[PDB]
């Protein structure tokens, strides 16, 4: 940076602290990643200055010729990545992407069926403190109490009982592959639309490591900033028949001016995802997660579902008689960032929990491999088995530092 | 830029086109401005990598120590700028800032009273194709057919007849000072909340050149990117009694993870606005708008309301027998960017219009003064009085180029 250090010492100091923090810590927050310098440069561009309400070639402001090229690059690259008939790259966030799909097909009070929030569903899939649960009547399907795999018979029964207008599939904390063919079969049986929220697994889908929801879903929503390793924002994919309706839901429906600079950054991130080396990266993410899961089990930890098919894992801490809150706190003390997370059928409140959620996307981006996974697992074991030992926590601290260099 | 040119030639070429376009054209879009290099650097920072749901010191992810400092800097500087008891700097946009206030105080189908959209009101103030008009029952107050000034007796009558739960004041295209004391008096009479959407005039308010709505409104919403000359985003100000409710409306209510990098950029923009030279800038904006208005009248143009108290003006093109659409198009041909805009009691549809909206914020930022205002007015006269003369349009083109250098 050149101008910010001089203009704003206070903001620059805090950014520099954050930059240094990102390098020093082992970031295992499953939803986080590190973007390229190219992506950041696009976000730091003059495109923030441009009002561009509407769509490429159909804007409500003149002078959009070049931002149109940028948005089109984003849409076309997204269609190339996922094989969607239509893309909308304007959603400000995952929240707004979901909001727009709901706005498109639902009326106030319509019934929607989504994944139980305590079994892995997201806030925007019907939380009573979120617009989703306040605006719509959300019902929930669960995972099996033993396998922690989605119970597709429960999905079906809930659908047939409650007759939802929309079924939502996908998750903030589900470690196994989701069967989209089965969701669509159930949706078809009850005459419901199917929406897949692939936010967490979007990079894995793009690399062919998770089945693609696009052929099965009427609508696919996602963030651009998790496994897809892009800037912070949302996106909607859908078939051509819903294109006009989806576009109008985003604008003039729920948003105003799009963030053209962030859309530029989306295009950059999509360009990166189309490359062979992104495919290799995504495989290392999944491989690392498998290795980490196995290594944690070797340390004596129980994992929700017994492992992982994707980038993320959930530790069930009940055998160690720890809450997720306690584990989160102590790991924070040694420089490992995780989040507490409810496990299926958790006896604890969502503010306490019996679990921690862990993901490998971020550490893989910084070049960690299988050996580092073993060591991260060894450090977690050392810490969680010795929460009362300051000497153990200091050893952990030193081993964490050895990893981040 | 260093990395984007190499990583993504296509995106870089289009950004560079846009950068060059921004310098070559005379940008008179009333909602646009040019941000500082410091603001852009903050948006281009690693802060995009951080999930930070919740609020400073009350986050739902660890590792937020430094992003907390950034968000707090933004909130405290905003409170310093506007004298608000509480600030929420997380809204992704003006749309979402409004959305959150509505979510806070209204139930589905509640009556809201806002400014007539064809008289200057915004899309988010009750358009039947926007969430506002679909979710809530919007009624409208108008401006006087002669003066084009808000008819406060009409505001009062509509309020007493329709009994709104919420009254919205402020505009996307209103060239005169708004009387917030009168809005609050009416709100008090009918027992309605008062929301002021100061998006357009926020920089003018901060510089003391427009009366401050904060003392009179229960809620004040704004964008950060118009006269405030910040990054693209939204903000809510409110009294302490609504702080907890407003924060919860933004999250977990209508958004997810905030854009911490954009919030950093907000803090930077607020720091800039607190400086004396911003005050001088904002006065030049208003002075330039007055000068431009006077100069256009000298050219024979009729202005909605007979002039301006702020950054923006509306030309009523009916005396020249032109539509706003025609004027917009021909001005685009010579390198002047305006937008068509409905005038009060416009006989034309909003897709055609009888007016053009013009603002001075952007040209003032690039250092245009009174002499440049005279010349811009002279060029507009030359073009609009000679729409069929390619020689006149070429002279205009050359004079536009002379201004942007």
């Amino acid at each position: 940076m050149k101008y910010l250090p001089q203009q704003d010492p206070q903001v620059f100091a805090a950014i520099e602290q954050e930059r240094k923090r990102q390098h020093a810590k082992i970031e295992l927050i499953a939803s986080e990643n590190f973007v390229s310098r190219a992506v950041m440069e696009a976000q730091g561009s003059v495109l923030t200055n441009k009002y561009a309400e509407g769509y490429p070639g159909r804007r409500y402001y003149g002078g959009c010729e070049y931002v149109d090229i940028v948005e089109e690059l984003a849409r076309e690259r997204a269609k190339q990545l996922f094989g969607a008939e239509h893309a909308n790259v304007q959603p400000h966030s995952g929240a707004q992407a979901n909001m727009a799909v709901y706005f498109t097909v639902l009326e106030h009070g319509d019934t929607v069926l989504g994944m139980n929030l305590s079994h892995g569903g997201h806030l925007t899939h019907g939380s009573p403190v979120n617009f989703s649960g306040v605006q719509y009547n959300f019902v929930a399907y669960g995972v099996d109490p033993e396998t922690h795999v989605i119970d597709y018979d429960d999905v079906r029964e809930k659908a047939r009982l409650h007759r939802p207008k929309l079924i939502v599939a996908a998750a903030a904390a589900y470690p196994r592959i989701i069967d989209f063919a089965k969701f669509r079969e159930i949706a078809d049986e009850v005459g419901a639309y199917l929406m897949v929220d692939m936010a967490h697994i979007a990079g894995l889908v793009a690399a062919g490591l998770h089945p693609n929801p696009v052929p099965y879903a009427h609508f696919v929503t996602t963030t651009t900033h998790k496994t897809l390793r892009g800037p912070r924002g949302g996106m909607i994919l859908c078939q051509e028949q819903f294109a006009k309706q989806i576009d109008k839901a985003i604008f003039p429906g729920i948003q105003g001016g799009p963030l053209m600079h962030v859309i530029a950054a989306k295009a950059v991130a999509f360009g990166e995802a189309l490359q062979d080396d992104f495919k290799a990266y995504a495989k290392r993410v999944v491989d690392n997660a498998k290795r980490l899961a196995s290594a944690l089990q070797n340390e004596g930890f129980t994992l929700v579902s017994g492992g992982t098919d994707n980038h993320l894992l959930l530790v069930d801490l009940r055998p160690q008689q720890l809450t997720g809150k306690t584990a989160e706190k102590v790991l924070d003390e040694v420089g490992i960032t995780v989040n507490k997370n409810t496990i299926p059928y958790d006896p604890e409140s969502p503010f306490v929990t019996s679990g921690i959620r862990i993901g490998t996307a971020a550490v893989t981006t910084r070049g960690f491999g299988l050996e580092e996974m073993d060591e991260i697992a060894a450090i977690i074991g050392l810490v969680l088995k010795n929460v009362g030992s300051e000497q153990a926590l200091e050893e952990a601290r030193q081993r964490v530092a050895a990893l981040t260099d």
Side-chain angles (χ1 to χ4, degrees), chain A:
Chain A
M1 284 174 189
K2 180 156 191 76
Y3 301 92
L4 184 57
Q6 173 68 196
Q7 168 64 45
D8 204 322
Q10 286 185 309
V11 171
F12 183 66
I15 289 171
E16 287 294 277
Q17 282 171 308
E18 176 58 17
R19 193 178 57 79
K20 292 163 187 184
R21 191 204 65 80
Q22 284 180 26
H23 174 90
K25 307 294 177 177
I26 296 165
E27 211 84 353
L28 299 178
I29 293 169
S31 51
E32 284 186 353
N33 215 325
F34 305 110
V35 297
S36 68
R37 288 177 287 197
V39 162
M40 290 184 287
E41 278 180 5
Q43 300 217 281
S45 73
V46 291
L47 270 61
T48 189
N49 301 145
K50 192 72 192 83
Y51 247 109
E53 294 179 341
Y55 292 90
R58 296 284 193 271
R59 300 278 189 198
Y60 303 100
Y61 300 86
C64 287
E65 289 85 359
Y66 314 120
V67 303
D68 284 5
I69 294 160
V70 171
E71 183 160 351
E72 208 54 82
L73 284 171
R75 300 196 295 189
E76 289 305 299
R77 288 166 184 186
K79 286 152 70 174
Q80 204 175 331
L81 273 174
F82 299 105
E85 286 176 355
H86 182 73
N88 185 305
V89 297
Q90 294 190 22
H92 295 321
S93 69
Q96 268 57 67
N98 293 356
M99 185 177 278
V101 174
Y102 299 157
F103 192 73
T104 298
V105 291
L106 309 169
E107 284 170 310
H108 175 261
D110 278 347
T111 298
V112 191
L113 173 64
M115 191 173 190
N116 191 304
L117 271 68
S118 57
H119 296 195
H122 189 249
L123 190 87
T124 59
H125 308 162
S127 170
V129 292
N130 181 256
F131 76 98
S132 56
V134 171
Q135 182 75 2
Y136 314 107
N137 184 52
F138 270 81
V139 290
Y141 54 86
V143 298
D144 183 275
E146 222 107 283
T147 69
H148 312 123
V149 179
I150 291 167
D151 188 333
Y152 291 89
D153 298 307
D154 190 51
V155 179
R156 190 176 165 257
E157 182 183 286
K158 293 292 188 291
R160 293 175 71 236
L161 176 60
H162 300 288
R163 305 301 311 267
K165 190 181 208 171
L166 178 69
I167 298 172
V168 172
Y174 187 61
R176 297 296 185 167
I177 282 154
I178 297 161
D179 194 333
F180 302 124
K182 280 189 191 191
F183 273 98
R184 180 56 181 272
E185 190 182 349
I186 294 162
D188 287 348
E189 177 170 14
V190 303
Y193 293 97
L194 173 67
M195 173 182 133
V196 171
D197 181 353
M198 69 169 176
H200 265 268
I201 60 163
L204 307 183
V205 167
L209 295 165
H210 189 288
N212 185 357
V214 170
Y216 304 101
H218 300 94
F219 313 92
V220 179
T221 66
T222 188
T223 55
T224 43
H225 52 273
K226 300 182 178 72
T227 53
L228 203 51
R229 199 163 68 179
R232 193 162 295 272
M235 174 164 67
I236 304 160
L237 310 169
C238 68
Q239 37 263 69
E240 200 53 28
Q241 73 177 123
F242 312 110
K244 187 181 202 158
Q245 284 160 303
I246 282 294
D247 284 353
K248 288 195 275 204
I250 279 289
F251 183 85
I254 71 144
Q255 301 187 173
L259 310 178
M260 293 322 300
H261 49 126
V262 181
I263 289 170
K266 286 179 192 174
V268 176
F270 303 161
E272 292 174 3
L274 286 165
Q275 299 164 7
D276 290 345
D277 67 354
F278 186 85
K279 275 72 172 185
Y281 159 68
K283 189 179 178 292
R284 290 195 300 278
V285 170
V286 178
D287 286 352
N288 277 352
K290 248 83 150 195
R291 184 61 174 246
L292 189 51
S294 185
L296 285 164
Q297 290 166 322
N298 184 239
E299 296 298 329
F301 292 105
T302 299
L303 309 175
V304 173
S305 90
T308 180
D309 295 338
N310 59 34
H311 64 300
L312 85 64
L313 62 89
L314 275 157
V315 183
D316 172 1
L317 293 162
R318 290 174 296 178
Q320 288 70 46
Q321 288 295 96
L322 301 169
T323 66
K325 186 179 171 300
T326 294
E328 188 182 52
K329 180 180 181 201
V330 68
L331 289 165
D332 177 76
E333 300 192 6
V334 310
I336 294 170
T337 321
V338 304
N339 51 252
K340 61 180 170 291
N341 204 105
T342 58
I343 65 169
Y345 309 88
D346 204 317
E348 308 278 354
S349 86
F351 297 89
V352 170
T353 84
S354 300
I356 53 171
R357 185 187 67 176
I358 285 162
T360 57
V363 296
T364 307
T365 287
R366 73 183 299 171
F368 283 28
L370 306 175
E371 295 309 297
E372 292 71 32
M373 292 315 100
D374 288 355
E375 173 66 0
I376 290 163
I379 295 157
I380 294 172
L382 176 68
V383 173
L384 298 186
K385 291 189 257 200
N386 302 97
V387 177
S389 173
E390 289 309 314
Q391 65 201 318
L393 302 183
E394 182 57 33
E395 182 190 327
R397 201 168 283 121
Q398 284 178 30
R399 290 163 68 172
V400 166
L403 280 169
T404 55
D405 143 304

